[PDB]
Ligand binder design. Structure first.
Ligand SMILES: CC(=O)N[C@H]1[C@@H](O[C@H]2[C@@H](O)[C@@H](CO)O[C@H](O)[C@@H]2O[C@@H]2O[C@@H](C)[C@@H](O)[C@@H](O)[C@@H]2O)O[C@H](CO)[C@H](O)[C@@H]1O
Ligand SMILES: [Cl-]
Ligand SMILES: [Cl-]
Ligand SMILES: [Cl-]
Lengths: 310, 309
C-alpha cells in the first residue's frame, strides 16, 4: 500500500556501497563468467539489508577493535587486529552474517590507516591519552584474515610503533592491484572453511540484458593500474529503502533515467526486488548521461518485460 | 509536503563535519564561541548552505592535482590545486566560501594524498602509475587558500609526490594543540575576508543551549581526544534536501523517543535554519538509549517553552 520511491540524487551526489567514495559513473559489462555476489551494498527494495551491509558509508571497509601483539608466526611487521562490531560490542559469530558489518567483500590488499588512542590506566583523562596512526595493509586473502572469527591481520611497513590499544582502520584504497578480484569473496573464517549467511549472487536472466553497476575508481598505494569497484545500488538508496520499507508489488520495478530539465528519457532499466539493476545493453561500456540525471520509478512490471535497447 | 525526520539511530548516522559515525549527543553553553560551521548546513526545507555537499565521504576531502612545491624552499610542502569534488574546475567568482567539503575549522587535517598519473603519449588506464602517502593540510597555513583554488599539503616524503592528478582522503588530525572547531579558516588566506558564509547560530530562548551530534576524531600523534560537533547529521541533510518539504513555522518540535517503550527521553526545538536547541544549562552529556531517535511532533513558535532536559 505504501508507494515505492527512488531518491532523486544525481550520480555525483551518491556513494559507492562497496567502498566509501563517491560514485564516478554508471557502467555495464557482460558478467556471466563471474559469480556476482557482493556482500556490501546489498538491500532489497522493501528495505532488508543483506550480507555484511550496514548503513554508514564511512564504515564500509572499516574495522574497529584493538591490537593484540603479533600473530602466531608472522613478521614483526604483522599485527593481530581483534575486531568488534562497528558499534563496539563483541561480534557474535553465531548469527548467520558472513562477518562483522562493513568487512571488505573482495579478494585484495586493503590499504588504509590504522589509528590508535590509548585506553590509559593508573591516572585518568581523555586529554593526556596518547595517539598514533600509521599506514597499513589488510590482506583479505591472508591465512589470518578471519573476520568472522573476530580478527584480521594488518601489516605495516618499517613501522614498529603499534601498541596493544584500541584501534580503528580507515580505508583509503588498495595497496596494489596484482590480484584484486572484486567478484571473488574472501574466506571470512580462513582457509578451508564455509562462508554462511551470504547475500545471494545476482545475474541477468532475460535475453539481451546485462547488470548495470555504479562504479568508482579507487586509490592505490603504489604500482600501475586503474582499479575500480562496482556496487549494485548506491549507499543512499540503501538508506532510503531501509527507512521506507515499501512493499515490492512485483519482482521488477521499471525505472527511467531522466534529464529533469528536458524530461527526455536517456534509457530504461529493471530494478529487481533483490536490489540490483539490469539494462538491455551488450558489451563493456560506460553509460554516458547528463550530470543532472537520475532514475525515476515508472511502474511495476514482470521479469519478462522487454526493455528498449540502449 | 509533510515534514519528516529519518528514523536512524545515532550510530547509524554520520557527522556532517567529518566523515565518521556520530558517537554521542552533547549540549554545552556556547556564549564564548561564534558557532558558524560551513559543513553540515541545510535548512529544513532543503537548502544547502556554506560549503555543504551531499556525499559524506567528500567532507574534508580534496580532489585536484599537485603543481610542484609551494612558493618557499620546503621540500616537504606541495602546491595542491583543487577542483570541484566532481572533477569540474572550481569557480572562485561564485558566492560560496570555498570548494564544497573544504574543512571549516582551524587545525591540522591529517590524511592520505593519492595520485594516479594522467595518460601520456602511449597510454592505458593500465599504464598509469600510482602512489599514496600520508600528508597534513594545515588550515591556518598562509598558503591555505582554497577559495583561490589551492591548499598546501605537507608530507613526510620529500621525493615521491608527482605533478599528477591527486585526491586527499581525510583520516583525522595531526595533533590537537591548536585545533579550534568553532574558528573558521581564512579560505582566501590572510589578505581577504571570508565570503558566502552560512549564518552563525546561537540559542536565544531563556535557558536553551545548542544540541550537537558529536564524534571523536583520530590523530596521527600527540596527546588528546579531539571531537567535532555538527548541527545535524549528514543523513538528515540528504533527507531534507530531497524532500524539500515547506517549513510551516520557524520551529519543529521534536521528541527523542525510545522505540522499545515509547517513552520520551526529552524534547527539543529543531530550528528552520537546521540546528537544535534544548532546555538545559551547562556542559553536559545526554544519556539516551542507543536505539533512540528524534520524532517530529508538530510545528511550534520560537516562543515555545521546552520541558527541561
Ligand atoms: C612502502 C614503501 O616504502 N614504498 C616506496 C617504494 O614503493 C615502490 C615499491 O613498492 C615497489 C615494490 O616493487 O613497487 C613500486 O615501485 C613502488 O613505488 C610506487 O609505485 C610506482 C609505480 C611509482 O608510482 C612510485 O612513485 C610509487 O611510490 O619505493 C618508492 C620509490 O621508488 C617510494 O619510496 C615508496 O614510498
Ligand atoms: Cl597470515
Ligand atoms: Cl587521467
Ligand atoms: Cl613516506
Amino acid at each position: 500500500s505504501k508507494p515505492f520511491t527512488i531518491p532523486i540524487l544525481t550520480i555525483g551526489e551518491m556513494t559507492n556501497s562497496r567502498f566509501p567514495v563517491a560514485i564516478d559513473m554508471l557502467h555495464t559489462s557482460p558478467t556471466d563468467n563471474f559469480i556476482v555476489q557482493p556482500q556490501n551494498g546489498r538491500c532489497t527494495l522493501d528495505g532488508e539489508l543483506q550480507g555484511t551491509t550496514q548503513l554508514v558509508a564511512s564504515n564500509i571497509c572499516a574495522f574497529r577493535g584493538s591490537i593484540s601483539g603479533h600473530e602466531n608466526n608472522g613478521d614483526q611487521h604483522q599485527w593481530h587486529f581483534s575486531i568488534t562490531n562497528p558499534n563496539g560490542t563483541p561480534f557474535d559469530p553465531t548469527e548467520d552474517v558472513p562477518a562483522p558489518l562493513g568487512t571488505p567483500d573482495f579478494k585484495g590488499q586493503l590499504y588504509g590507516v590504522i589509528s590508535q588512542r590509548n585506553r590509559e590506566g593508573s591516572s585518568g583523562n581523555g586529554n593526556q591519552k596518547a595517539n598514533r596512526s600509521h599506514e597499513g595493509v589488510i590482506s583479505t586473502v591472508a591465512p589470518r584474515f578471519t573476520p568472522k572469527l573476530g580478527s584480521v591481520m594488518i601489516g605495516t611497513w618499517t613501522t614498529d610503533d603499534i601498541q596493544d590499544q584500541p584501534s580503528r582502520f580507515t580505508p583509503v584504497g588498495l595497496n596494489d592491484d596484482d590480484n584484486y578480484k572484486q567478484w571473488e569473496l574472501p574466506n571470512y573464517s580462513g582457509a578451508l572453511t564455509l562462508n554462511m549467511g551470504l547475500a545471494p549472487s545476482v545475474f541477468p536472466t532475460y535475453p539481451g540484458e546485462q547488470l548495470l553497476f555504479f562504479r568508482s575508481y579507487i586509490p592505490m598505494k603504489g604500482g600501475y593500474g586503474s582499479p575500480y569497484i562496482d556496487c549494485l545500488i548506491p549507499q543512499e538508496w540503501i538508506s532510503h529503502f531501509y527507512q521506507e520499507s515499501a512493499p515490492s508489488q512485483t519482482d521488477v520495478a521499471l525505472i527511467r533515467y531522466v534529464n529533469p530539465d528536458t524530461g527526455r528519457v536517456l534509457f530504461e532499466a529493471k530494478l529487481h526486488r533483490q536490489g540490483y539493476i539490469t539494462v538491455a545493453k551488450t558489451g563493456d561500456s560506460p553509460i554516458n548521461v547528463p550530470a543532472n540525471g537520475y532514475f525515476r520509478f515508472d511502474s511495476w512490471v514482470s521479469q519478462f518485460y522487454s526493455l528498449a535497447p540502449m
